[PDB]
Structure formats: structure tokens, C-alpha cells
Copies of this chain bind each other. A is one copy, B any other.
Amino acid sequence: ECLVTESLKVKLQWASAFGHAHERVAFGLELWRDIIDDHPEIKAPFSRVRGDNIYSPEFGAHSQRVLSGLDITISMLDTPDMLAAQLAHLKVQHVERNLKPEFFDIFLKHLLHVLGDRLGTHFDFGAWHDCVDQIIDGIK
């Protein structure tokens, strides 16, 4: 698994990085942009939420909804009973539907890249990789 510290570290850093209000939308946007430019194949399933124009409110909304869920998982994360439950809950919202496996491995790649910029050198890559990974697999 993860370590209790390795979590608190992420729970904490997520705070500074993510931020509040607009600061977030900015984060979300910056994230998805980098992702879609790297793998335009994704603009496909995001057809429902105007994935062609990530600056649009339709997508913007989505963007936020996503990050929010990520917030939950991360906030779940430390305390096992909630995480195990939350993760199971996410798995369902996915299994039903097709998604590629590797897409998430991509999402993670960038989420770390971005937090890297936001947090700087303090960014505990180790802790995040070990920790956010666990969140991806479960949903996955």
C-alpha cells in the first residue's frame, strides 16, 4: 500500500497546489490542455462535454467535476475504510463504460507534471506516484 505519511504529504501538497475558486479552474484547464495536446485521441469521449474547446464553459464544468472527484479520493485516501469504499464507488462509474487503460497512465503523467510546476522542488514525487497511482488502478 501507501504509508500514512506518504498520504498526509499528498493531502497537504494537494491543498497548496489545487487551491481555491478560480485558481482551480486555471489548474484544471492547464492540466487537460497538456493532456489533450499529447494525446488528441482523448477529444473523442469528451465529445459530450465539448472537448474540442477546453476553454468552453461546458468543458470547464467537466474539468472541475473531475478535479473535485480527485480531491475526494485524495481526501479519502488516508483513512482506509473511506478510500476502499470511495474507490469501489469509482470503479463502478467506469467498468460499465469503455475507457482505455493507458489513458489514466497518461492522466497521471501530467497531473504530476503540473503539480511539479505548482509545487516546485518540494513536490514529493515519490509520495504522489505511490499514492495517486493507487487511486487510478482502483477506478481503472
* Complex copy number for this chain: 3
Given A37-B113, A113-B37, does the pair A55, B125 have CB atoms closer than 8 Å?
yes
Interface on chain A toward B: helix, strand, loop, or mixed SS? helix
Contacts of A113 in B (CB 8 A): 37
Contact of A121 among B37, B55, B122 (CB under 8 A): B55
A120 to B27, CA, bound (A): 11
Please provide the chain A residues from 38 to 94 with a CB less than 8 Å away from any CB of chain B in the complex: 53-56, 60
Number of A residues, CB within 8 Å of B:
20
When C-beta atoms are compared, the residue in chain B nearest to A22 turns out to be: B121
Is A111's beta carbon under 8 Å from chain B?
A: no
A120 to B120, CA, bound (A): 20
Shortest Cβ distance from A101 into chain B, in angstroms? 19
B33 in contact with A126 (CB, 8 Å)? no
* Listed residue (A54, A122, A123, A125) with the most chain B CB atoms within 10 angstroms of its CB: A125
User: Chain B contacts of A33 at CB under 8 A?
Assistant: 116
Instruction: Determine the chain B residues whose CB is within 8 A of the CB of A126 once the complex forms.
Output: 53, 55-56
In the complex, residue of chain B having the shortest beta-carbon distance to the beta carbon of A54: B125
Which residues on the B side are within 8 Å of A25 (C-beta)? Answer: 121
Beyond the given pairs A37-B113, A53-B126, 7 more chain A to chain B contacts, judged by CB atoms under 8 angstroms and listed by A's residue number, are A26-B121, A33-B116, A53-B129, A55-B123, A55-B125, A56-B126, A60-B121
